[PDB]
RNA sequence: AGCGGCGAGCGAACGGGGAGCAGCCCAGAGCCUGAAUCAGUGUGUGUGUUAGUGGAAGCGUCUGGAAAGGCGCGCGAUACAGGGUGACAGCCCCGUACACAAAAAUGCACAUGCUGUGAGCUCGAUGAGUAGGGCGGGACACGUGGUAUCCUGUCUGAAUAUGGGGGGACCAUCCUCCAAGGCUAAAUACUCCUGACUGACCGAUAGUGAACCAGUACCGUGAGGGAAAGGCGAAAAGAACCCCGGCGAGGGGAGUGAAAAAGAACCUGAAACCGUGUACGUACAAGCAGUGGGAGCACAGUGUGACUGCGUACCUUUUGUAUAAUGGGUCAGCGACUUAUAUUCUGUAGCAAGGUUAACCGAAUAGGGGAGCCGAAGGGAAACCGAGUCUUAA
């Protein structure tokens, strides 16, 4: 059978040009009054998935 | 290239791409194996532990008796029950690319003029549909193990080689990897080598 | 393609029981016992190719020591006296002389006793 | 060149790991699996993205965005495809006749991706600023 | 795409390529008025099925128990598929290719005659406790969620073509269709069963549980479970007769036969295991029984092995096992990393900015089929822009 994409991962990551994955940062949902505006400013761009995590993501996203 | 006829000595023109290519052995080995595997009638099966006739009753209890623990009379460790990874009927066909199949046939026909096993004739028919005449049609030609490849639908010639074991008649569209190799001479009528040159471009 | 394995398992077993001739009891007849008899016997054979070169050097040195002491010197002073005299005969041949040509050994001891002292 | 003379290329056929077949094979008695754990059991092995029971990375992180339903019906036309449209007129429906975009596409964009050579006529599409400066550089009119 | 403790997982459509492709009735009265239809029944034809018939050609010779083998020299072949015959047969047999055959009974078409339904035209008609709704459930990929649509247990309840449904909450447009009656071939699924035919399927611990009087013997009150067990030889020519014995059993002859060490407890006849004969060793010598050295002896190098150095099995599991931890009485046979599909990577091969087809068609591994898929472009949540783009007034 076809490999089923982990569908909850397909909403967290998007594949980029050289092959890696962009993702939204954690810690920017709620409880923001106490967070600094500098710290919240750096969680707003999308980051690239780290080296050690990438083997866990391509396992999850085979049709990315 | 050029292909000299059997006796008219007037060599018809072929494209050197089809009859003078360099031989590719890895290409021809792959298409001669995929022909051989696609001839498999993959029809066999055995019984797994599910399919062996028996009861799912555990033979003895798990503890207590000093026997080894068992849970099915149809386990594959046991006699008369269960092949472990039992066969199913399967498809042993392989995919060949068309440019790999045509590259192989262009490389076999190029090699048949190298080892002088391609002989091009201009006509190879026989009057009566009799095996006796064709048995003669190949003594003067000095052939015993041959594959005749014609362009027409000659059924007189087709029956006359149906009993001769080492003689095969084709129709220039069903020539294959293993037939162009397993015969000592390949003899092609001049109308047939026109068609075979065409389909291999 | 079912493969029966009675022919090549017989031969593989027969090859090991043939290496176990002369072994006591089930070590010559039973494959399970004779296999680890043969594996142990090859283990010992590896080890005693090392010990053979020690046991013979032990045997030569004990015979040169006896044959030196009949000529009135110890093994240590005879081997030191041969090295100061630059005589390069090994102990295999020094023991071979000591039983077969004793008068060729009393000459060797004299050539050692001289150049030592 | 007989049937008993044909060989594969060297290295085209590796053998295949046969596990659990003695000491010399280097795959006996465990099958390359090591000693007793979950991963050495038959069928054992955890599912994808399992981290132990630590919150997995695809659940540690927020979902973002939405699927557009207009990016599924748009395509990009490279300048390499402006010569294959069979007539010099690049409509939307003539890019499908040459099997360039796809039959469910309603919007195509012509982007600067390589070597427009011919008098072409793009009608009803979008072109970029580079592709407009290349179509007119070869003698093409965009409608 | 979505659904989803947005977890595990579930998973479409639209659209496209194909296989196969027929539409028709009643809610209805008239003119016309068997008017084709679609059925059944019956002769008639064509064709299978159910018995069958014909088939084409080789002899010498050596080995051998026996020739189909070897060597020699011919002949058939639209037949050299297969099987049998004293060893391996184109030419000995049965067949096979091919050419043929049916009293009678049936399958299929067709030709239909005779019966049943019943055309075509004019007009009207246009399926109500329904649709919809409230409540509760279920089905849709869709878990009530913003949620369409379908079904309906319960409670209600329209409009009746100038009207009604749907287009994913809902509304307006404007596109499309006409629910609440019904019938409908092919493409599709299957194989208890019959016929051929095939196999990189099994070869008696395998293959059906069952190659054999097998769902049997046996077991169970019962439901139920459920075995083991193939082979003389070419042909019984299966051992007349004589001996020992208990008018035994078994045996020894004689005989058959190529072979009886093929004698029926029968091809081959392994290993464990048990004997006999022979060589050597062994009755003052301590222990993984070997190994290294090594006399003596017996043979024609082999066998044995006094004395002697070193030396606590194997596996498993472990920090670690001679361990007094696990496992194994032994032999023999079987017994554990497979298969399908998807994905990624390496090798390799073909073709390269292109590469490849899937189903299907098909004189079938060909050729056709480019529906698609992947790649040549990416940024962005997206619109969008595009070799750049997002970020941000910049």
**Which backbone phi and psi does A58 adopt, to 5 degrees?**
-70, -25
Of the candidates C23, C50, C25, the residue with the CA atom closest to the CA atom of residue C39: C23
Residue where the block lists tokens 């002073």: C77
**Which backbone phi and psi does D107 adopt, to 5 degrees?**
-130, 130
> Which letter does DSSP use for residue B147 in this model?
E
Among residues 13-52 of chain A, which lie with CB inside 8 Å of chain D?
13-14, 23-26, 28-29, 46, 49
D61 touches A23 (CB < 8 A): yes
Which token pair is D15?
């053998």
Rounded Cα distance, B180 and A26, in Å: 67
Q: How many C-beta atoms surround the C-beta of residue C3 within 10 A?
A: 5
SS3 B34: helix
Of the candidates B148, B155, B134, B156, the residue with the CA atom closest to the CA atom of residue B179: B148
SS3 D121: strand
Q: Would you tell me which CATH number, out of the four given (3.100.10.10, 3.30.360.10, 3.40.50.720, 3.30.70.100), belongs to the domain D74-142?
A: 3.100.10.10
Rounded Cα distance, A62 and A1, in Å: 13
Which experimental approach was used here?
Answer: cryo-EM
Rounded Cα distance, B37 and B177, in Å: 12
Residue of B nearest to D9 (CA): B26
CA angle C99, C100, C105 (to 5 degrees): 75
Buried b or exposed e, range D58-93, using 16+ CB within 10 angstroms:
beebeeeeeeeeeeeeebebebebbeebeeeebbbe
**Which backbone phi and psi does B146 adopt, to 5 degrees?**
-145, 155
The answer to whether D58 contacts A13, with C-beta atoms less than 8 Å apart, is yes
CA R_g for chain A: 14
Q: Resolution (in Å) of the shown entry? A: 2.8
To probe the interface with D, which of B23, B24, B25 has the most D CB atoms within 10 Å? B25
Show which positions of strand E are touched by protein (CB under 7 A): 1-4, 6-11, 14-16, 76-81, 198-210, 215, 224-228, 270-273, 288-293, 303-305, 309-310, 313-318, 328, 330-344, 346-351, 353-358, 363-368, 370-373, 376-388, 391
Q: Which residues contact D86 (CB under 8 A, 6 or more apart)?
A: D94, D97, D98
To probe the interface with A, which of D51, D52, D59, D62 has the most A CB atoms within 10 Å? D62
The answer to whether B32 contacts D7, with C-beta atoms less than 8 Å apart, is no
**Which backbone phi and psi does A5 adopt, to 5 degrees?**
-60, 135
Which uninterrupted H or E stretch holds C67?
helix C31-70
Of the candidates B1, B169, B3, B199, the residue with the CA atom closest to the CA atom of residue B101: B199
The answer to whether B32 contacts D6, with C-beta atoms less than 8 Å apart, is yes
A15 touches A48 (CB < 8 A): no
Strands B12-13 and B118-120, how do they pair?
Answer: unpaired
Domain ranges in chain B are 1-201
Sheet containing D121-122: which strands, arranged edge to edge? D89-90, D121-122, D141-142
Q: How many C-beta atoms surround the C-beta of residue A11 within 10 A?
A: 17
Q: How many C-beta atoms surround the C-beta of residue B90 within 10 A?
A: 11
What stretches of chain A show up as alpha helix (H) in DSSP? 37-42, 54-60
Which token pair is B182?
């397993």
A3 touches A55 (CB < 8 A): no
Rounded Cα distance, C71 and C91, in Å: 17
Q: How many C-beta atoms surround the C-beta of residue D18 within 10 A?
A: 11
Sign of CA dihedral C16, C17, C18, C22: positive
Which residue among B25, B115, B182 sits closest to D7, beta carbon to beta carbon? B25
Q: Is residue B105 packed enough to be buried (19+ CB in 10 Å), middle (13-18) or exposed (0-12)? A: buried
Phi-psi region of B40 (alpha: psi -120 to 50; beta: other; left: phi over 0): beta
The answer to whether D1 contacts B181, with C-beta atoms less than 8 Å apart, is yes
Sheet containing B185-188: which strands, arranged edge to edge? B118-120, B185-188, B146-149, B167-170
Of the candidates D61, B107, B1, the residue with the CA atom closest to the CA atom of residue A47: D61
Q: Which residues contact D3 (CB under 8 A, 6 or more apart)?
A: B32, B178, B181, B182
Q: Measured in whole angstroms, how far is the alpha carbon of residue A36 from the centre of its chain?
A: 22
């Amino acid at each position: 059978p076809k490999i089923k994409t982990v569908r909850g991962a397909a909403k967290r990551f998007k594949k980029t040009g050289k092959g890696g994955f962009k993702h939204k940062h954690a810690n920017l949902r709620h409880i923001l009054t106490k967070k600094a505006t500098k710290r919240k400013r750096h969680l707003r761009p999308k980051a690239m998935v780290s080296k050690g995590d990438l083997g866990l993501v391509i396992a999850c996203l085979p049709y990315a | 290239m050029e292909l000299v006829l059997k006796d008219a000595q007037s060599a018809l023109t072929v494209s050197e791409t089809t009859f003078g290519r360099d031989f590719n052995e890895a290409l021809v080995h792959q298409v001669v194996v995929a022909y051989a595997a696609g001839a498999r009638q993959g029809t066999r099966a055995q019984k797994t532990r599910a399919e062996v006739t028996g009861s799912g009753k555990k033979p003895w209890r798990q503890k207590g008796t000093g026997r080894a623990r068992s849970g099915s009379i149809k386990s594959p460790i046991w006699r008369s029950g269960g092949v472990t990874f039992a066969a199913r009927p399967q498809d042993h066909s392989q995919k060949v690319n068309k440019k790999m199949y045509r590259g192989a046939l262009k490389s076999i026909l190029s090699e048949l003029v190298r080892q002088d096993r391609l002989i091009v004739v201009e006509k190879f028919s026989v009057e009566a549909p009799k095996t006796k005449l064709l048995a003669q049609k190949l003594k003067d030609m000095a052939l015993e193990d041959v594959l005749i490849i014609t362009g027409e639908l000659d059924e007189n010639l087709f029956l006359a080689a149906r009993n001769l074991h080492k003689v095969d008649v084709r129709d220039a569209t069903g020539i294959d990897p293993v037939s162009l190799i397993a015969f000592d001479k390949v003899v092609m009528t001049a109308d047939a080598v026109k068609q075979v040159e065409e389909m291999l471009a | 393609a079912r493969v029966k394995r009675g022919v090549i398992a017989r031969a593989r077993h027969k090859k090991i029981l043939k290496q176990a001739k002369g072994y006591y009891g089930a070590r010559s007849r039973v494959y399970r016992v004779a296999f680890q008899a043969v594996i142990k016997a090859g283990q010992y054979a590896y080890r005693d190719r090392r010990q053979r070169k020690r046991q013979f050097r032990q045997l030569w040195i004990a015979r040169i020591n006896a044959a030196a002491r009949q000529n009135g010197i110890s093994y240590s002073k005879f081997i030191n006296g041969l090295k100061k005299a630059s005589v390069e005969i090994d102990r295999k041949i020094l023991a071979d002389i000591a039983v077969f040509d004793k008068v060729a050994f009393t000459a060797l001891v004299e050539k050692a006793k001289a150049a030592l002292a | 060149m007989r049937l008993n003379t044909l060989s594969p290329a060297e290295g085209s056929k590796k053998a295949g790991k046969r596990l659990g077949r003695g000491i010399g094979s280097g795959l006996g008695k465990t099958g390359g699996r090591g000693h007793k754990g979950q991963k050495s059991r038959s069928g054992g092995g955890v599912r994808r993205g399992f981290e132990g029971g630590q919150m997995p990375l695809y659940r540690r992180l927020p979902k973002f965005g939405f699927t557009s339903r207009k990016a599924a019906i748009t395509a990009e036309v490279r300048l390499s495809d402006l010569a294959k449209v069979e007539g010099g007129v690049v409509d939307l429906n003539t890019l499908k006749a040459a099997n360039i975009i796809g039959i469910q596409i309603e919007f195509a964009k012509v982007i600067l991706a390589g070597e427009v050579t011919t008098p072409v006529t793009v009608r009803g599409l979008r072109v970029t600023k580079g592709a407009r400066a290349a179509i007119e550089a070869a003698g093409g009119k965009i409608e």
